Structure 1
Amino acid sequence: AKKVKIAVDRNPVETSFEKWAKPGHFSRTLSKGPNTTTWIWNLHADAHDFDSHTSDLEEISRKVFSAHFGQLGIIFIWLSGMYFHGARFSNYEAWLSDPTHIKPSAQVVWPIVGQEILNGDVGGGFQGIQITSGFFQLWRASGITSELQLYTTAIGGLVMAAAMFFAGWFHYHKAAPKLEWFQNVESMLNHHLGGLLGLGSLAWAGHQIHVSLPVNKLLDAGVDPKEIPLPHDLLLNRAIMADLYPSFAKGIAPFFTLNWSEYSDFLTFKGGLNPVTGGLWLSDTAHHHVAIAVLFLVAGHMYRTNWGIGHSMKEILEAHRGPFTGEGHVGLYEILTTSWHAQLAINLALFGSLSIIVAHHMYAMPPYPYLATDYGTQLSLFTHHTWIGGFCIVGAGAHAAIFMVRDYDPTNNYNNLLDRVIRHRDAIISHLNWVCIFLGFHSFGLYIHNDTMSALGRPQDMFSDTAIQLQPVFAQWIQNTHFLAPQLTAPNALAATSLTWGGDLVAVGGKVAMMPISLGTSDFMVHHIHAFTIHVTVLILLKGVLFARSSRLIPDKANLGFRFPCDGPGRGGTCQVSAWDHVFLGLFWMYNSLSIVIFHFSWKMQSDVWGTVTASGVSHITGGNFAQSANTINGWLRDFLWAQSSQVIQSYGSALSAYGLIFLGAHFVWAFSLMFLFSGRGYWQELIESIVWAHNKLKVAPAIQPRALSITQGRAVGVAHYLLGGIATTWSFFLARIISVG
């Protein structure tokens, strides 16, 4: 019964610049200094690999804790800059008056070498680069109405950034928590559930109830922003609040007398979108965060810390034991309290999956005012948070394999769930292998079938709505069920959560904010492409984790490590057997799969949702050509890539000309990467020998011997440039397109 308590060590480390002048001090191998250029790369590669610098878990934990303060401090500088640039280099104040006609802008370029052309005409008597980060919509929702309010937040952001860097220094050099402190998982969950998420949600509900709701109620009514009461006047004067919301006339007595229905005027359950702004009702959002606050505060009292009541996480795991799984969840608690990599593998997996869920829900239920009709912001936010989720998931596979090689110990794992999974890995991979082959034929083969039938003049033989049909009946049933939910299954909800299920479109400023989305044969085909490319990515990453330690090819792969190039040309060749190489290959397939996801979103929205409302009806940007054209590969090449890339390639001479340059430059970086992927360092080391000879001939040869990159660094350099070039190419193509037409 070890008590939960604060435990630190005083002055564990000395604050000196001595080690700043001795590169490689952290590692025994690199401390001796460089002899070849390979040393330089090894310095940066192993800088943050704490688990390999020392075998002491306590020393590892202390570095992780303070390295996290540095990450927090950097985000505050970044957040402070975004708020500061909104105050000083933006047209936010003009945007508040005419949100539907003025383009948000918060970056201005200096007039040098003729780059001032990038300062485009955005509206409000302002010249600058149009932004797609959606900060203007966020600031309006919170109630910000002046650049002074933006300026104060930026100054507060810098103070927080200074506090974060002080905390990191303090908790590493002055008062470093001990290992027993870090292992109070029950205590940490209690505070992070009820304290971080719980009180954070309640505190934000306080801001919305007292600041956001009154300010946005008057803004929607048409009141001039400068004439709206200041947030503190709303807080101090209950009389003003009563006018906007009569419930405030009764104070907090209804809350304590359980007459919660009195607050129905500002704690609503409307559903749908606000017709004036096209975003979610803020009164709905306030009741959301009040409900979420109570749920998490209750969640934070589940685990036992010091007073008997509560649950022991170890006891829960050991009680869940069945007939089919041997010992069961035994041994997981020790794994998850002694391996940082195991914790990181889980957290990256769900944090990445969460970021992808955010992308889907924010576009379908636009939570900010004027977010929906700003098509550039909608496209950018969905695409940004899909890419973030994709990288995090691939990292989850990377750090699951690191655990398997370094932190896995067979003695603690005998006949438990983890052990039994390893003992039928061939069954898992063989079945997942077949599923991927099945999904590739029956999804991408359909496109090849349609392309061949179309080229042969046999349109009646294609898979399409006017031909052999493939209707997503299951998805269509769910769309109808959610559309009728308010009638019978959610009686107290006035409207459906989203307008995608069905109903009538909402138009703001003559543009569609959201309307029902219909699923047809093309949607059926593209969705099963997603299932195919996701399943393949699982195969590559899961295979690396399950075979990290050994396989039928390399029986002792664990001893070789997590990151090695091969085990030589024997046995036919063993290139890229290490678990690190399964992340390297998994990155390509993740990039392949998410590229189709963001092409699917971009074409579907322009074709079927986005458009201009007129007297006759809705005219969409691409005129509803998704249904008939997206069933062939040729349709994607012609109608999507070739037609929509018109904007980016005609950008020269305009404010969007920067996107044209980056479109070419991205194409360059991508092709440049194939040099590293298609070659090997054997050629390059011999090439450097001849180059070194010329320098030797001129007495200008370096003391640090030039070396071709290692085998692994060639693969890492290749994939990093491949991803940057590919992703930046889509980034330029999307923004130049949507900003130009959207």
Structure 2
Amino acid sequence: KKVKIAVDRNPVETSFEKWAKPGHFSRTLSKGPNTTTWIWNLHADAHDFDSHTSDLEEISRKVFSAHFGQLGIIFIWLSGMYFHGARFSNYEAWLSDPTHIKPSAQVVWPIVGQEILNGDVGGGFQGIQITSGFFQLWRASGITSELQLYTTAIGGLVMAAAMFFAGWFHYHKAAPKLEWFQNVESMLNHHLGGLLGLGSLAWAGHQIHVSLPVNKLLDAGVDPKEIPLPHDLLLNRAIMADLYPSFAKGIAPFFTLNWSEYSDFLTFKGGLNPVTGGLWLSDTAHHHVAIAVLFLVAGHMYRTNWGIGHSM
């Protein structure tokens, strides 16, 4: 196998000893300060890995675990936005009147008079009116409860710990070799296929099974505590057939290629939903389905270990 897993076991010993020595990465900065330019060169040359060493394998290992550090920080960030949307928000109120209640997800502590920033955003709530658009994401995902926001915040903390452990593992315990990184055909096949293709197929699954029925019941006008939970939308095909009457035919039109019968919930409407001013979620559903098929086709392009495929 030319394309194969190839790592190195225990390359870098996990120790706080080099945290005690600032400038350990640099040949010039390791002697310590004599001059305040040292402490700016410490922070400027900190992530310039190509100037630390000349070994491209070590540079690739450092930049592959720094990406797990960035991913763990993004999962801390996303999980914090879900947590602040759960515990400090008017999102429960915002779902009942999303035209007269301002989206707020940041509340300040009343100390030095800064509690004037807790303005009257509506829904019996005081906080800072957010503008990052998370409440519209959460309506488009079919959340309808701050319990789901709290649990995906806990899942984001778990996934951030997974990313931090992953960077620790793939730098300190089992770090990949150089010719692992140089398999760009396999990286493109897996990223077009698995990241982009399977990710939009999975979001197509969430849009077909969760967000289309929940947002259809919202647009018809139903209280969010009256809407069936989305696990009661997975298990009960009868509710989905009440909402979209081609779920009664099952996945039989998909394998008999009678896909036009799926036109109840995969559409090509275009324009806007006049109830809510957004895109039709059946249209975005068929969008991510077609994007998924396209990128799963595109991720079978490059030659890795069998003679089929292109080499770049």
- Structures share fold, TM-score greater than 0.5: yes
How far does the alpha carbon of each residue in 1:133-179 deviate from its partner, in whole angstroms, 9 at most, with x for none? 01000000000000000000000000000000000000000000000
Give the TM-score taking structure 1 as reference length.
0.42
Secondary structure (helix, strand or coil) at the match of 1:112 reads coil
Give how far 1:250 is off: 0.5
- Equivalent residue, structure 2, for 1:188: 187
Cα distance in 2 between the residues matched to 1:307 and 1:36: 58
Distance 1:279 1:38 in 2: 53
Q: Give CA deviations for 1:284-328 in whole Å, capped at 9, x if unaligned.
A: 00000000000000000110011100101xxxxxxxxxxxxxxxx
1:297: which partner in 2? 296
Q: Is the partner of 1:101 in helix, strand or coil? A: coil
Paired position in structure 2 for 1:45: 44
After TM superposition, list the pairs within 5 Å mapping 1:398-547 onto structure 2: none
- Give the CA deviation at 1:243: 0.4
Deviation at 1:28, TM superposition (A): 0.7
The whole-number CA distance in structure 2 between the counterparts of 1:92 and 1:230 is 17
The DSSP-based 3-state class of the residue aligned with 1:78 is helix
**CA shift for structure 1 position 202:** 0.2
Please report how far the alpha carbon of residue 255 of structure 1 lies from its aligned counterpart in structure 2 after TM superposition.
0.3
1:197 and 1:207 mapped to 2: Cα distance? Answer: 15
Kindly report structure 1 stretches of 4+ aligned residues shifted beyond 4 Å. none
Deviations 1:65-113 (A, max 9, x none): 0000000000000000000001000000000000000000000000101
Q: Secondary structure at the match of 2:95?
A: helix
User: 2: distance between equivalents of 1:309 and 1:222?
Assistant: 53
Once the two structures are TM-superposed, the CA of residue 256 in structure 1 deviates from its matched residue by: 0.2
Give the distance between the partners of 1:36 and 1:241, measured in 2 at CA. 70
1:129 counterpart SS class: strand
Deviation for aligned residue 1:59: 0.5
Distance 2:308 2:31 in 1: 55
* Aligned twin of 1:392: none
Structure 1 residue 60: Cα displacement? 0.4
SS in 2 for 1:25: coil
C-alpha displacement at 1:283, in angstroms? 0.3
Alpha-carbon shift at residue 32 of structure 1 (Å):
0.4
Structure 1 or 2: larger helix share? 1
The 5-angstrom pairing of residues 239-318 of structure 1 reads 239-312=238-311
- Within 5 Å, give how 1:609-688 maps onto structure 2: none
- Output one character per residue of 1:174-202: Cα deviation in whole Å (capped at 9) or x when no partner: 00000000000100000000110000000
Unaligned runs of at least 5 residues, structure 2:
none
Alpha-carbon distance in 2 for matches of 1:267, 1:49: 48
Corresponding residue SS for 2:279? coil
Structure-1 separation of matches of 2:124 and 2:71: 37
- Once residues 108 and 267 of structure 1 are traced to their aligned partners in structure 2, the CA distance between those partners, rounded to angstroms, is 40
Task: Give 3-state SS (helix, strand or coil) of 1:164's partner.
Answer: helix
Cα deviation code 1:338-377 (max 9, x no counterpart): xxxxxxxxxxxxxxxxxxxxxxxxxxxxxxxxxxxxxxxx
Distance 1:118 1:300 in 2: 50
Distance 1:142 1:36 in 2: 54
Paired with 1:40 and 1:149, the residues of 2 have a C-alpha distance of 45
Q: Give distance in 1, aligned partners of 2:58 and 2:217.
A: 55
Render the CA deviation track for 1:459-498: whole Å, top value 9, x for unaligned: xxxxxxxxxxxxxxxxxxxxxxxxxxxxxxxxxxxxxxxx
Shift, 1:61, TM fit = 0.3
Partner residue, 1:225: 224
2-side partners of 1:241 and 1:209: how far apart? 10
Give, in angstroms, the shift of residue 64 of structure 1.
0.3
* Structure 1 residue 263 displacement after superposition: 0.3
For residue 62 of structure 1, report the CA deviation from its aligned partner.
0.3
Q: Tell me the equivalent position of 2:133.
A: 134
Q: What is the deviation of 1:19?
A: 0.5
Once the two structures are TM-superposed, the CA of residue 269 in structure 1 deviates from its matched residue by 0.5
Aligned pairs for 1:146-157 within 5 A: 146-157=145-156
Say which SS state the counterpart of residue 19 (structure 2) adopts: helix
User: Residue 23 of structure 1: CA displacement?
Assistant: 0.6
For the aligned residues, what is the CA RMSD?
0.6
CA distance in 2, matches of 1:250, 1:43: 64
Counterparts of 2:44 and 2:164, CA distance in 1: 23
User: Any idea what SS the aligned residue of 2:159 has?
Assistant: helix
Normalised by the length of structure 2, the TM-score is 0.99
- 1:213-248 Cα offsets, whole Å, 9 max, x none, are 000000001111110000000100001110000100
Q: Secondary structure at the match of 2:8?
A: strand
Report the CA distance between 1:275 and its aligned residue: 0.2
**CA positional deviation for 1:22:** 0.5
Match of 2:120 in 1: 121
Displacement, 1:10? 0.6
Separation in structure 1 between the aligned mates of residue 223 and residue 115 of structure 2, nearest angstrom: 33
SS of 1:9's equivalent in the other structure is strand
Q: Distance in 1 between matches of 2:300 and 2:151?
A: 36
Between the aligned partners of 1:162 and 1:89, the Cα distance in structure 2 is: 24
- Hey, what's the Cα distance between the residues in 2 that align with 1:223 and 1:19? 59
Between the aligned partners of 2:85 and 2:263, the Cα distance in structure 1 is 35
Q: 1:502-546 CA distances to partner (integer Å, 9 max, x unpaired)? A: xxxxxxxxxxxxxxxxxxxxxxxxxxxxxxxxxxxxxxxxxxxxx
Q: SS in structure 2 opposite 1:225? A: coil
CA distance in 1, matches of 2:109, 2:280: 40
Percent of aligned pairs sharing the same letter: 100
Tell me how far apart the structure 1 counterparts of residues 254 and 117 of structure 2 sit (CA, whole Å). Answer: 54
Q: Equivalent residue of 1:26, what SS?
A: coil
Deviations, residues 263-286 of structure 1 (Å, cap 9, x unaligned): 000010000000000000000000
Runs (5+) with no aligned partner, structure 1: 313-742
Equivalents in 2 of 1:278, 1:141: separation in Å? Answer: 12
SS at match of 1:128: strand
> Residue 356 of structure 1 corresponds to which residue in structure 2?
none
Q: SS of the counterpart of 2:175?
A: strand
For 2:118 and 2:304, the matched residues in 1 are separated by 58
Q: CA offsets, 1:532-569, max 9 Å, x none? A: xxxxxxxxxxxxxxxxxxxxxxxxxxxxxxxxxxxxxx
SS in 1 for 2:238: helix
Q: Measure the CA separation in 1 of the matches of 2:80 and 2:276.
A: 27
Q: Give the total of aligned pairs.
A: 311
How far apart are 1:257 and its partner, in Å? 0.3
1:437-468: per-residue Cα shift (whole Å, max 9, x none)?
A: xxxxxxxxxxxxxxxxxxxxxxxxxxxxxxxx
**Partner-residue secondary structure (3-state), 2:160:** helix
Mapped to 2, the partners of 1:237 and 1:155 lie a distance apart of: 27
Alpha-carbon offset, residue 206 of structure 1:
0.2
